[model samples]
Target chain A: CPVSSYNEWDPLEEVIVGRAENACVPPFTIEVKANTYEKYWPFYQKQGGHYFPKDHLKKAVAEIEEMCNILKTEGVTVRRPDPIDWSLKYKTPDFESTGLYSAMPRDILIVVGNEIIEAPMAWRSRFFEYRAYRSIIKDYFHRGAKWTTAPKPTMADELYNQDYPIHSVEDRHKLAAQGKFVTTEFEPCFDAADFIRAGRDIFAQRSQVTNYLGIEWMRRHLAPDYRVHIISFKDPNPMHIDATFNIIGPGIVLSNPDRPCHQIDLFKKAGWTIITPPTPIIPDDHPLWMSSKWLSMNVLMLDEKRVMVDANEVPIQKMFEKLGITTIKVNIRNANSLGGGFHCWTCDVRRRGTLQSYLD
Target chain B: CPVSSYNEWDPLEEVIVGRAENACVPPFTIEVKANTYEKYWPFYQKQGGHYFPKDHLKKAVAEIEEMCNILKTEGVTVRRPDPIDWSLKYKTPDFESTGLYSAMPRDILIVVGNEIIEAPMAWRSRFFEYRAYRSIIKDYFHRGAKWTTAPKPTMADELYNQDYPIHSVEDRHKLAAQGKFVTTEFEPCFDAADFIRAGRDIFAQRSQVTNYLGIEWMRRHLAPDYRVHIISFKDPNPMHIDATFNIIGPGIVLSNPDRPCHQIDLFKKAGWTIITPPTPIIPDDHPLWMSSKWLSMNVLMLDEKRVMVDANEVPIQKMFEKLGITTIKVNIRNANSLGGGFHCWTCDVRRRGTLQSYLD
Candidate 1:
C-alpha cells in the first residue's frame, strides 16, 4: 500500500520563511475569545451588571513576548499568538467552546476538516448559521500557513454527512456544500474507550470521507507515521487526542507525543526524529517557568531550529539560545486556554485537494 | 517518640459487628450554605452580589450528594458537604484565584487564623492585610487537625502549626469546635515528589497514624501505604490531595487503579483493605486520555454498603450495584471542577479539642 503522504505540506517552512517574502493572512492571526467573563459559568451570575469585561489582557501580552524571545533564539520564525475575538453579540450554547475565545479559531486554517464545516450541532449553531464566520476562521489559518513553519493539510470532508448545506438560515448553506453522504455527528458518549473504539471503527473504512485525519494506516490506530512533536504547555485542559501527526510538508511533519506509539511507528519504520520533552510541573518562582506561565507547550516551528512557543517556557528559550535556534513567543495565553493553541487554534491551508500522493 | 494515636478514638464495633443498628450523624450539625447559589462570589463593584448563588449552593449540594452516594456503597462516611455561609464577600487580590469566588472562603479562614475582626473587604487598602490572607491560607490547615486523621504531636509549632487560629468568626469559630478544622487549608506545596515521599516521613516520625495493615514490609521506597485504606476515584480539578484517605473514615476502599499504589500503601499501613479494579480511566466518559475525571476516589459513606460518589461516572450505579453496594449519585459537576469530590468538599468532625487543650 502506497503511503498517502502530503510530504510537501510543511507549515513551518511555508508560513514562516515563505511568508517572510510573501506574508499571508496578516503576518499574525489574532486569536480571541468573546469576553465571557460575565458568561464564565463559575463567576457569571455573581455580579449583575457590575461585571468588568476588561480583564488584564496585558498578562497575555507578556506571555507572547516570552514565546517570541524563545523562538528568536531557536532558528524558528515566530509570530506572537493573537488576542481572542471578544465579540459579545451572540448568545449561543453549542458555541460553548467558541468565538474570540473558542479553542478553535474560526478564522485560521491549515486544514479545516469536515467536522469544522459541518461541525457537530451540539458543538455550534454557528456552523449552521454563519458562512462569513466559518470563512474567516479558515482564511486566517490559510494565511498564517503562508508564513509559519508548521504543517498545512488541505481541509476536506470525506464523510457524506447529510448535515451539509448546514441548516443555518439559507445563505450560510452556500458555504456548506451539499455532500453525497449525510453528516456524522460526534456524540458525547459515556465511555472514552468506547468513544475511541467507535471512532476507530468508523475510520477503518479506507474511504476518504470516513477518515477524519485524512491519512490512513493499514493498521487501525489513528496517528499517521510522521515525525510528530507536541507542545502542550499553557493549555491547562490538554486536548491530548486532538494531537495527531500527518504527512504535511516534504521532509517536515507535525505530531504530538501526548498520543504516541499507536498507528505507524515513526522512530522504527520511518527513522523519523521527534522532539518533545516530558512536561515538568515547574515551580512558579522559577524564571523560565514563571516567564511563560500559561504558554508552556503550544509551539510552532518555522524551521528545524526556529520555533514559536508559548511565552512561559523561558528555559526553552535559553536552551535554544545556546543551540542557536531562533524562537518567537506569542501572547496567546487567553486564546490558548479557551482550547486552541497556534496549531489547533488556527487552521492552515497550503494547497487544496490531494495534490500529491501518500508519503510511503 | 510516642506513637501518635488518638486517645479517644475507637472503632464503633457494636455498630459494625453482631448488632445490626445503623450508626449515623444526628441532624444537630446540619447547616446549609444559604444563598450559596445566590451569592457564592460577591459583586466586583460593591462586593455584595453573588454568582448563581442559588444555583451555586443547589448545584454544590446536588454534586456533593452525588459524590456521597458513590462512597456509601464503599462504606465511607461524609458529613454535609453543603455550604452554610451565604455572605457575598471578597478578599485581596493576592488571595484571589481569578477573583472573589476564589478569595472569599480563603479570606474568611484567614480572618479566623489572625484574630482579626473586620467585614469582608473589596480590596486591601494595606499590604499587611494581603499578607494576612496568604499566611492563613497556608497556616490554617494546622488549625483544623480534628478534620485531619492525625492529632497534633508534642511539637505544636513546627510539625503542626498552632501559632494562630483560623476561622475565628463567632459562629464559624464556635462551629469549628465541632471538628471542621478547614482541613483543606493545610495543603503541602505542589511538588509531585512530596506526595511520593511523604509516606517515609510519616514512618520516620514514629507516627501512630501508621497503617495497621502491617504492610510496612511492602512499603517500597517511601511510597503511600495502602494499609490506611484510602481509595480515590475521579480527579476533581484543584485535585483534592487528602481525599484519598485523610477526609474519609478508614474502612474498605474501592478505587480506580490509576492511583492504586498510593492507596494500597495507605491502606496496608492503616489496617484497612482496599479493592480496586483495573479500568482504562476513572471517569469513563472523559476523552480517553485528555481528561482526568476520576474524582470518585473521594467518597462518602451513608450507611451499610451505601456510598456517595461523583455523579459524573456513567456506569457508577451499575458498577456499585453489581458489586452489591448502593450509591447516591451527587452531581457535583457544577461545583469544584478541578478535583473536589465529597471528601474534599465535606468536613466531618469526629471530635474537638477541650478547653485546656484549646488554651494551650
Candidate 2:
C-alpha cells in the first residue's frame, strides 16, 4: 500500500518514469562546465537556459512514452511527473538561474524501504526541480508513504569553487585522485543516482556532485537498519554511479570496463560476482552531453532474469544474454542525448523484495 | 553531541535563540490572511514585503538580548542565527515572494533526540527562511548531529485556497470543525512549532499552516521510535501548538482556557496534570499582529522546577509560583508583536533527559 523497495533487481511492481518534455539545457555554470565534456561546452554556451533542441526533445518524448508503454505491458505500474516548462528563471536571495530537465528520475528520487527520499541535488539549475514530482509524490504520501527530503543546500557562492579548473580531463583526474570535487563541503548535497542500492547495504561514491559529507549524511541517517558503504572508482570525471558500477542482482554487479572500481577487491572477497561489461558501442558522433559512452553498462533489471537494456548497445546486450539474463531491448538513443540510459531515466518504487544482507 | 532533547522541562543545556533584527511583514497572501486576525489586516496590507517598524524591531532586539542574558545567567548555553536582510525578494518557478523574518527558531527547527529537523514551512514569504540557520545547522552536522529537512512545499497557487473566507472568525470556526484549512492537501507542509514533544509520544495539530499530510509524514518517519498523535481544539485559528497546549514535563501540560482541546479527556484518562493557565493580562491596545494575547502563557522552561515567565504576565507567574515552580521574569512585549513568546522563539537543542514513554 505504501513505499517498500530494498534492492534494485527485485521484481518491479511500480515504477516512476521520468519525462523528457520541455527539458531545458542547464546554464553553463561552474558545476555544469566541470561535469560535462569539452565537446559540449560550446553547445551549452549557445543553448544554456534554452530548451534542448526541440526535435531531439520530441524524439526523446516519443521514446520515453514507448518505454512507459513497454513497462505497462510488462505488468508494472508506471507513474509520471506533471509536464513542466523548465525554462522559467528563478532567483533566490543568493543567486539566480533556470532549471534543468526532470528527465532523470534516478537523479532525484530513491525508494529505501517504505520511505522515498528526495536527494538534495548539487546543481543550481536543479534547486527547484523537485516541484515537478510533487503532484505524484503527494499522492504517494496521502496513501501512507514516508516521504523525506535531505537538507537542501543554500547553493550560494560558497558551495562551489567558482574558479574550478574545467578545461582538461587530466586536471579532473588529478583532482579526483586527491578526492577533491567542484562541490565544496559547505553543505551536504547528492544525487540519488550516485547511490547503488543492495539489500541491507547501499554503495555510494564521492564523485563530482556527491561529496563525502553527502555520503556521511546518508550513512548516518540510514544506520542500524541499513549500512551505507563508500565505494571508489578510477574514473576522471565521476558523476552518477549507474553507468560505472550497477548492481544487477543480489551478488552480481556489472562493472564498467572503462572506469574500473578501486574497491573491487572488497566485493570479490564478499563473494560478489564482478562481471566487467564489454566496451560501449556508441558512436563518436553521438551527442552524449550529460553522460559518457559508459552508459552501455547502465542496464535496468526487471528481476534476476530480465534486464531492460539498450537495443543499440548490442555488445552489452549479448553480454547480458550470455549470463542467462533475458534482454528486453528498447532503443532510447535519442533519449540518451538527454543524458541517461534505461536505469537512469526510471526510479523503481515497489520492488518485490525484503531487506537482506548479501554481503553477510 | 549536537542534538539531544527528549522533552521540555528537562535540565536545559543548549538552546537556539531567534533574532528580531530585520523582521519583514509577509505579503498579504491568502494563508497569511487566514491565520491573522482581521484587526491587523490593514497593517499587513500597508506593510507587506517591508521591514517591521524599526522602533518596535529595535525594542524586540533589545528584549531578546536580555532574554539570552537571562538564559546564560541560568546556566544554559544560547546560540543565535546570523542577522540576515529579510527584505530580499526571491522567485521560484511556481511563485515569487519576499522573505519574512527568522525571528522564531522554534517555528522552523525542532530537535528530537539526536536529529535537528528543518521544517518545510507552508508560508510563501518564509520559503527560504532556512537560509538564516544553515551556518549554525551545518556546524551541528559537522559535529555529528543528524540534520534533516522535511520535504519542501512548492507553495504554488494550488497549495492555498485563493478564495478562502478571511473576513469572519465564525466562518473559520465552522471550517475548522470540518477539518478544512487554508492550505490544501496539495502538499505536506508544517511549521516545527506546531508539534509539542513529550518523550516517546509527540502531539501535533492541523493548523492553518500544518496540514494532516504533514503530520502523517512525521508519524511514518519516526515510527516505532516515537509516536505522533493529532489533537484538536475549539479555536477558530490555530497555528503553533506551544501557545495552546504546551507540554511542560512528563504527564504535565498547559491547556489554554480559551481554546480548550477537544481530546482533553484522553490525557485525563492517562493520569495527566492538564493545568489551565490563568487568563492573559496584555492590554487590548497592544498589537499582537501575528498571535493572540495568549503569548502570556507561551512560557519556556529551564527545568522541571524553573520557568521563564514574562514580566508583565503576573497572573501566569503567580499560577506557576503556586505550583512550586520558580519563575524567571523577562519582558518581550515588542517581540511578541512579531509573533512568539519564550517557547515560540527558542528551540532547545540539548536537555539533560532520556527518552521515556509518558502516555503509558
Candidate 3:
C-alpha cells in the first residue's frame, strides 16, 4: 500500500519530510498580513519575494538532515521533496507572486486510508507549491494510491478583504470572534494543516486560510464513510490547527493552553485526555514571520509511545515523558522561523493501522 | 440534490451551457498543432493570442443563445458561465500563454451522482478556464452539491513532446496506434469530454490530450463505487469521445462510422445496441477550426426518447427518427466553428434516474 494513515500515534512506516532549500518570503499580500503578527510586518515589506536569511536557512537545512537521519534510525522510511528555485516569479490571471518554501508537507498533503489529497492552498505565492512533490506522488499513484487535488481558488482581489484592519491585534480579535476572516467565501481554499484526522471522524477548523465552504467541501466529499466536524478555538488569528489542537493518540490530544477549544466538552464526554503543553520558551525576539511562538506544542508522534519533539523545549518533553511517551529530541530553531515544527514539517504516508472509531 | 447525473439518457433536469463570447484562438504550440487540422494551422498562426473573427463569433454567440432558449423551453434549468476575455495573457512559473474560450462546458465539467468535478485540462491556453464557471459551481455547492477538482498539471515544457511529427496524418495514425500521444506521462491531465458516464461504469480513452496517468488517477479516485474502463478508437487524432461514441441510453450508443471502437464485442456481448450513424454531409468549404465533420453524430439525449440534433444534418436526423427517438432540431452551423455541437456545449448537472448497472 502506498498511502495508509488514519491517526497520528500509529506506527509510521513511511513519511514525507519537506525541504528548506531555496525557501523565499511570500509577498506581503492582505491574506499573508492577516495571518502574520504585527511585529513581522516590516520584515515582510522589506523581504517579500526574496529568499530567507541565507545563514539561517543553512542551519535549518542541517537540522532537518539530522532529523531525517534520526527518523531512519527509528526504522522509518523518509522521503524529501525535490529542491526547487522558489524565487521564480509567476503571474496568474488574478495575481502575481513568487513562491514560498515546501518546508511543511503537512500543509499540502494529507493521507486518509489509501488516498493522498493535495490541498488547494490559499496563498498566492504558494500556488504552484505542488510541483515539487509531483515526482514522488506519481510513483505512489503508479503503485496503486489514490490521488486527489482540491479546487484551487482564483486568488482574485475578491478572495481577500483588502481593507482588513491589520494595524492592531485587538481589531483582529474582535473580527475573528464575529466569524470574519480575511478570506471570503469566494471559493473553497484550504491548507491541509487546518485539518486533524482521526480514524473515522476528522476534525477541522475555519481559520484565516480555511473557510466554512472548504470544510463543507470535505464533509460532502468524504460522507457516508467519514465524518468531518468543524471545531473552533479561542485563537485570534488561527491559520493551522497542528499547533492549536494536535491529536497525539486515539483519544488523546495536545490542546494548546493559550487557545482552548470551545468544544472541549465533546472530547471530555468521550473520555479523552486533553493535555495542555507548557508555554514555549523561545525568546520574544526570535523571528517567527508566519506563525506564533506556539510551535513548541507542534510535536509529531511516531507511535503511541514515541514522539519527535524539540530538544530545547524541555517542559513539553517532561509532559510527554510523564504520559509514558519517549521523546526523540531534534532542534531546528531556524526552521521554526518558517512557520512549522516537527509535526508540521512531516506527513506520515504509511501508518500500520486500520480505520477505527475512537470517539464513537 | 444539486448534482445527480448518472447516465446520458436520464431526463436532464439542470444543464450548463457555455458561452461563445470573447473566444480567442489558442497559440499554435506543439500540442495545439497536434490536435488541430493542418488546414487550420495558418488560421492559428495568424490569429493566435487574438480574438476570433468578430463577425463569426457574433453569429456563434447568437446560435448558442438560441440553443440555451431551447433547453429552457424543454423545462430544463439552464446555467451559463460568466463571459471572460479569453485573450488575456497569464504566466505561471512553468509556462505562459493566452487563454482559450469557455465555449464548451462539457470539455471541463462532469457530474457523477451528487458530485461535479472540474477536470484538469491538458491545454495550456485553457489553464484558467475554471474561473468562468466558479460562480455557478459555488452556487450548486451551497445548494448541496459535492464539488471536486482533479489534479492540475504544471503544463511545463516537459509535459509536451516539443518535436512531435505533425506533418502527415499517416504519421499521427502510426503513433496513435502505438499508444504514443503528444502528451507525455510527465503529469496527469485530461478533459472531461474524454469520459462517458454509464451509471456504475464509466468509460475513458487515452487521446492526444489525455494520458494513462490521468485515467489511472480517475480510476483510483472512484474505485469500490464506480468502475472506470479504458476504451480505444481507430482514429488518427482523438481528443474528445462525444463524437466517436455517444452513449444515448442504458445500453445504447451511437458509434461513429468513420472511427470504429476496438472493443465493440465487449459492449455487444453485454447486450448493448450499437448503432452506426450516417457519415456527416457538411461541405468541405465550411470552416471547422477545431473539430472534424463527425460532429454531426454528436447528439445530446434529452431523455431516452428525445435527442437534440443538428437541423442541417438531415441524414443523422433521419437516423435518430428511425430509432423511435424524437429529434429536436437546432441550427448551430456557426457555433460548430468553435469545436462543439449540442452534446459538446452543455453539461447535464442533474438527471432524473437512479444508479444501476446496465452491463451486468
lDDT of 1 by residue, B55-106 (tens): 2333333343344344444444332211111122234433311112221121
**Clash count list over all predictions:** 185, 0, 0
The Cα local distance difference test for each model comes to 0.28, 0.88, 0.89
lDDT of 2 by residue, A1-360 (tens): 557899999999999898776688999898998888888889999989988886666567667777877898898999887556687788999889988888899999999999999999999999999987897889989999999999998989888989887577778877888877899999999999999999889999998898889999999999989999988878633589998889999899988777788889999999999998888888999899888888788888889999999888898889888999999999888889888999999999999988999998
- Residue B94, candidate 1: alpha-carbon lDDT: 34
Best by lDDT: 3
**Full-model lDDT, candidate 3:** 0.89
TM-score of each: 0.27, 0.51, 0.51
lDDT at B289, model 2: 83
Candidate 1 error regions (>4 Å): A1-53, A61-108, A112-122, A125-261, A264-267, A281-295, A314-325, A329-336, A349-359, B1-360
Cα deviation of B219 in candidate 1 (Å)?
45
Better of 1 and 2 by TM-score: 2
Cα-based lDDT at residue B291, candidate 1: 14
| Candidate 3 Cα outliers beyond 4 Å, as residue runs | A1-360
Ignoring the other chain, what TM-score does chain B have in each prediction?
0.36, 0.99, 0.99
DockQ of every predicted complex: 0.01, 0.01, 0.00
Can you tell me the CAPRI class of model 1?
incorrect
